[PDB]
Ligand code: HEC
Ligand code: HEC
């Protein structure tokens with residue numbers, strides 16, 4: 001899968017969590033988001049195609065996925081503890097991670 | 107200044123920027139936010155007193171302020187270009203940083 005695919009997965013599944021018709025859909029969507037974020041961390045965004053892997057722009061891009069994965073894991077822990085409403089509230093706060101990275105690099 | 111006064115400065119100046127309609131107003135408010143964030147960048151929240159300076163929790167707290175200052179700096183550059191509406195949109199996006207740190211450490 002490519003970066004565009006990963007971003008579609010992130011977008012669809014964030015919306016799944018918001019509209020989840022049952023509690024179990026939340027964990028499943030978070031699981032897919034986690035994998036998409038780790039896959040996207042290994043891509044080069046078009047606006048950074050000139051930059052080397054050691055460039056500060058690429059460093060911040062990769063770090064954004066690490067941080068998103070950490071907050072996905074926090075929400076997964078809540079869901080796995082049965083605190084699914086808390087997990088859904090935590091998932092809503094993931095949008096700020098999308099917005100921040102996009103501000104820089106989308 | 108203390109943490110609570112620094113936080114009040116950030117809180118009030120976000121609204122100053124939203125209320126503004128010219129580049130000088132936005133620049134002046136962003137400059138005040140920058141000074142507040144810096145004054146608190148080296149401090150320690152109550153819930154982290156018993157933590158090493160290099161602990162993961164302290165490191166994430168400090169990265170919170172460093173990253174907020176970076177995005178204030180980016181919004182300042184927009185104001186300095188006369189890009190009032192873009193600077194205001196960047197300022198509104200700062201709220202993600204506020205809520206992210208609070209949810210971890212408030
Ligand atoms: C960087 C660390 C990112 C994070 C976190 C998220 N996204 Fe992203 N996104 C990023 C880039 C660099 C791009 C541009 C990709 C390109 O090839 O142009 C995008 C793009 C999107 C898109 C549009 C995809 C397309 O087909 O053009 C969507 C729908 C999208 N991103 C969604 C999305 C969501 C919902 C995120 C949070 C859960 C998210 N992204 C995180 C970089 C980064
Ligand atoms: C961590 C890196 C933070 C960032 C970024 C922001 N804030 Fe914050 N805030 C933080 C702490 C640890 C605290 C509590 C301090 C304590 O000793 O309890 C706060 C508190 C506030 C408050 C309430 C003030 C009070 O006296 O309780 C407000 C109104 C506030 N913070 C606003 C605010 C805004 C608008 C921010 C972004 C622009 C922001 N904070 C960032 C830690 C951190």
Ligand code: NI
Nearest residue numbers: 067166206210
């Ligand atoms: Ni975090």
Ligand code: NI
Nearest residue numbers: 060100104173
């Ligand atoms: Ni950033």
